[PDB]
Amino acid sequence: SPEFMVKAKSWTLKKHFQGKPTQSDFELKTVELPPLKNGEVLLEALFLSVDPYMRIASKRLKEGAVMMGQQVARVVESKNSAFPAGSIVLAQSGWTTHFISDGKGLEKLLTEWPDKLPLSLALGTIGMPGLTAYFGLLEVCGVKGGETVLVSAAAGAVGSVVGQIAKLKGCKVVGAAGSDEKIAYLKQIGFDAAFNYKTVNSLEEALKKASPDGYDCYFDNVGGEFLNTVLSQMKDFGKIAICGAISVYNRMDQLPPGPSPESIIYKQLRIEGFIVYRWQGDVREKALRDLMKWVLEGKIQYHEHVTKGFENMPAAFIEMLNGANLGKAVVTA
Amino acid sequence: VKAKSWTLKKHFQGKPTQSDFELKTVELPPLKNGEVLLEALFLSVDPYMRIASKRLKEGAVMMGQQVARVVESKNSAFPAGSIVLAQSGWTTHFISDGKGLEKLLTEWPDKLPLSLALGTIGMPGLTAYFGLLEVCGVKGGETVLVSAAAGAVGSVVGQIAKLKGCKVVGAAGSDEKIAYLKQIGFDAAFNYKTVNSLEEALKKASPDGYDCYFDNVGGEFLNTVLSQMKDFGKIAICGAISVYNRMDQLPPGPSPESIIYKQLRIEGFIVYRWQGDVREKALRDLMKWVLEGKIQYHEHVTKGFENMPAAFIEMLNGANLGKAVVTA
Ligand SMILES: NC(=O)c1ccc[n+]([C@@H]2O[C@H](COP(=O)([O-])OP(=O)(O)OC[C@H]3O[C@@H](n4cnc5c(N)ncnc54)[C@H](OP(=O)(O)O)[C@@H]3O)[C@@H](O)[C@H]2O)c1
Ligand SMILES: NC(=O)c1ccc[n+]([C@@H]2O[C@H](COP(=O)([O-])OP(=O)(O)OC[C@H]3O[C@@H](n4cnc5c(N)ncnc54)[C@H](OP(=O)(O)O)[C@@H]3O)[C@@H](O)[C@H]2O)c1
Ligand SMILES: [Cl-]
Ligand SMILES: [Cl-]
Ligand SMILES: [Cl-]
Ligand SMILES: [Cl-]
Ligand SMILES: [Cl-]
Ligand SMILES: [Cl-]
């Protein structure tokens, strides 16, 4: 009988980003949630993800609207038999502490989830970033064993998974990241070579040392000038998997000088863009099962860059874009 | 026998000019056993020379292919009177040991000028053939966009696309070329220099986008094209002539948004990838299509060897409608 009010705090986009996003570009809001109707569920955020795509997606957002994003949430109350109270779901509810859903876009976490594995992994290694790495490496680059893979943003969510999957498939992997701490971490988890792209004397020389015979596949997470230099190091018929281009996300209106036609033509390179969502159904489930299996087998180690508290979400996002994160950037409510 | 040759006096900076070239005359030594004396008949000028020249040491002879006649021979495989395709560079006479020489397709029809062996029924025609059929991999019904459409490669791409049952849109740099493109079969053709907006022109030519873009120009044009590609669309990077004069200062790169969200497949290629029987078969097809009238042709002929640099300079500037060819 007793009814208790549920307050939902949400992070809104106060002002569109100009260059690097800043705290002031965000505005916290609180709203009293209405009662649950039949077929609806009340969700309470447990772990919220901040991702690079939010920098671009925020452009199609009207100022004042809630920032987009996925989170792991617990069903606190339920009037929907498919999502019982207490169950855990993945929801594209945006940056909010509580959310009422009719169950439409909700995704149940992988069945038989191990107690030892934090639920937040469903937002990284055993989630979208991990799936991105899986399909970009295995399908787009199509590695079969013995090839040499280069991966940028190597100590990041996607990058760290790419390198480890490449290693378990029997490939040689070289990684590029932005800090000495990250480089040490990469060598710890199996990367054959790794270098701090910020402190190189020569990007080209760094790549040459890492792999003298060149690269079979380049999993591109950064684009820009880095991509331009990588093309000269690709093996003939090499493949470039265009996953993202974070180096230009803050300057989409001032794109740097483009790639050289010389390398693309003479080396007959294949460049392909892809989005995780191209893979669905059974193939997507098998990928999740594989990622889970590989984590349980110790083949894919992980690390989460946790930011405590919902009120610190803008900071977690900003800092992730700036490279503060080693592994998946996750925010605990 | 005094051979005249065009040398690179000074590396090109931006647009190449006449003074960058220097004509040299040398008396040739006698032929040694196994050698032959070639006499240039038709010499080709091509966009790639603008890039390959960067690797040359100043004073060296410009690189290139030509159709030549054997006028003196000490090699049984090439008796006097034979016609060959030789990579002899910009020269009126050349001594070869025969190793790099290529004989023209057997059964070559008298009605077809020999210079076609340097174009439509040669390297440029093969580039169009393989880039369209293998790189774009069109099977029929697709909408194909081709830049430098009225050029040597472009003109063949558009016509092969048409005979394969595709819709073809071409972009070129003059109204004269646009009229020509329509007369030979292109479904749509526009002047990229005078259209109010490249994007509007592309949209009007194909409201539902493009399945394959045969890229001969690159640069800003390519960047604009990406937004009009259908999802999973293929771009055949054949060339990027719009940046050949500014390789050291490339224009803004392509948008990651288009490549990623549309999941585009971009692939560079070189004609030389296809060799042997497949290459010979392609030449046969091109030959047949020309004889059947499916592939019409036009050559932009410049008279006189002394005018070779001008032919090269103007071709890069877009003066040519069809293959740029120089008669000795
Ligand atoms: N196509 C798809 O479906 C898809 C899906 C998910 C993600 N992506 C893309 O995948 C990439 C990685 O995403 P993620 O979620 O795994 O993020 P993440 O790598 O965990 O975090 C982003 C990382 O990017 C690096 N970075 C920031 N600015 C940079 C710059 N100017 N140059 C080079 N590196 C820079 C930083 O590492 P520092 O030490 O290394 O430099 C930062 O930690 C992003 O480009 C993202 O857009 C694509
Ligand atoms: N990968 C390979 O194996 C291979 C082989 C042969 C050729 N190619 C490339 O294929 C392309 C066509 O070669 P081709 O022999 O057939 O030459 P072509 O097209 O007969 O002549 C070059 C034409 O390029 C156009 N052009 C020049 N500057 C331009 C600019 N800034 N923007 C747009 N168009 C410009 C001009 O036509 P407009 O009047 O239309 O501007 C000019 O007539 C070149 O890029 C060449 O490098 C590649
Ligand atoms: Cl924004
Ligand atoms: Cl911006
Ligand atoms: Cl930071
Ligand atoms: Cl030069
Ligand atoms: Cl230059
Ligand atoms: Cl001209």
B1-119+298-328: CATH topology is: Quinone Oxidoreductase; Chain A, domain 1 (3.90.180)
CA dihedral (B124, B126, B131, B132) positive or negative: positive
Are A10 and A96 spatial neighbours (Cβ–Cβ below 8 Å)? yes
Q: Is the shortest distance between the CB of A72 and ligand 1 below 6 Å?
A: no
Angstrom distances, CA of residue A277 to CA of A128, A131, A222, B40, B136: 9, 9, 20, 58, 25
Q: How far is CA B134 from the centre of its chain?
A: 17
Cβ neighbours of residue B151 closer than 8 Å, sequence gap 6 or more:
B172, B216, B320, B322, B323
Residue whose pair of structure tokens reads 């946790």 in the numeric block: A306
Please name every residue paired with A70 in a beta bridge, in sequence order, or none if there are none.
none
Chain A residues whose CB is inside 8 A of the B218 CB are: 261
The SS3 assignment for B251 reads: coil
Superfamily of domain A1-124+303-333: Medium-chain alcohol dehydrogenases, catalytic domain (3.90.180.10)
Are B168 and B185 spatial neighbours (Cβ–Cβ below 8 Å)? yes
Structure token pair of residue A253:
């209106």
Q: Which residues surround ligand 6, an ion (CB under 5 A)?
A: B 11-12, 53-54
| C-alpha of residue A181 to centroid of ligand 4, in Å | 29
Cβ of B259 and A242 within 8 Å? yes
Cβ of A273 and B267 within 8 Å? no
A221 annotated binding-site participant: yes
The SS3 assignment for B85 reads: strand
Domain B120-297, second-level architecture:
3-Layer(aba) Sandwich (3.40)
CA B269 – CA B215 distance, rounded (Å):
11
Strands B36-44, B93-96: pairing is antiparallel
Angstrom distances, CA of residue A196 to CA of A173, A178, A217, A329: 15, 5, 20, 20
Domain parsing of chain B, residue ranges: 1-119+298-328, 120-297
- State the smallest CA–CA distance between residue A112 and chain B in angstroms: 33
- Cα torsion for B82, B87, B89, B95, to the nearest 10°? -50
Cβ of B260 and A244 within 8 Å? yes
Q: Per residue in A33-50, is it b (16+ CB within 10 Å) or e — as a string?
A: eeebeeebbbbbbbbbbb
Q: Count other C-beta atoms under 10 Å from residue A308's C-beta.
A: 10
Structure token pair of residue A102:
């009719």
Experimental determination approach used:
X-ray
Resolution (A): 2.0
- State the smallest CA–CA distance between residue A323 and chain B in angstroms: 20
Chain B residues whose CB is inside 8 A of the A257 CB are: 249-253
| C-alpha of residue B261 to centroid of ligand 2, in Å | 29
Of chain B, the end-to-end C-alpha distance in Å amounts to: 15
Cβ of B263 and A243 within 8 Å? no
Fill in the amino acid letter for B102. Answer: E
Are A250 and A55 spatial neighbours (Cβ–Cβ below 8 Å)? yes
The residue to mutate among A158, A252, A277, A318, having the most atoms of ligand 1 within 8 angstroms of its beta carbon, is A158
Cβ neighbours of residue B29 closer than 8 Å, sequence gap 6 or more:
B95
Three state DSSP letters for chain A: CCCCCCEEEEEEECCCCCCCCCHHHEEEEEEECCCCCCCCEEEEEEEEECCCHHHHHHHHCCCCCECCCCEEEEEEEECCCCCCCCCEEEECCCCECEEEECCCCCEECCCCCCCCCCHHHHHCCCCHHHHHHHHHHHHHHCCCCCCEEEECCCCCHHHHHHHHHHHHCCCEEEEEECCHHHHHHHHHCCCCEEEECCCCCCHHHHHHHHCCCCEEEEEECCCHHHHHHHHHHEEEEEEEEECCCHHHCCCCCCCCECCCHHHHHHCCCEEEECCHHHCCHHHHHHHHHHHHHHHHCCCCCCCEEEEECHHHHHHHHHHHHCCCCCCEEEEEC
CA B312 – CA B49 distance, rounded (Å):
9
- Cα torsion for B277, B282, B288, B292, to the nearest 10°? 160
Cβ neighbours of residue B119 closer than 8 Å, sequence gap 6 or more:
B44, B125, B152, B297, B299, B322, B323, B325
Is the CATH number of domain A125-302 3.40.50.720? yes
Q: How far is CA B181 from the centre of its chain?
A: 17
Report which secondary-structure segment, H or E, holds B56.
none
CA A162 – CA A53 distance, rounded (Å):
18
DSSP one-letter code for B305: G
CA B188 – CA B38 distance, rounded (Å):
43
Task: Select from A330, A325, A331 the least CA-distant residue to A181.
Answer: A325
Angstrom distances, CA of residue B267 to CA of A240, B94, B237, B239: 10, 37, 6, 11
Tell me which of B220, B245, B263, B270 to substitute to probe the interface with A (most A C-beta atoms closer than 10 Å): B263
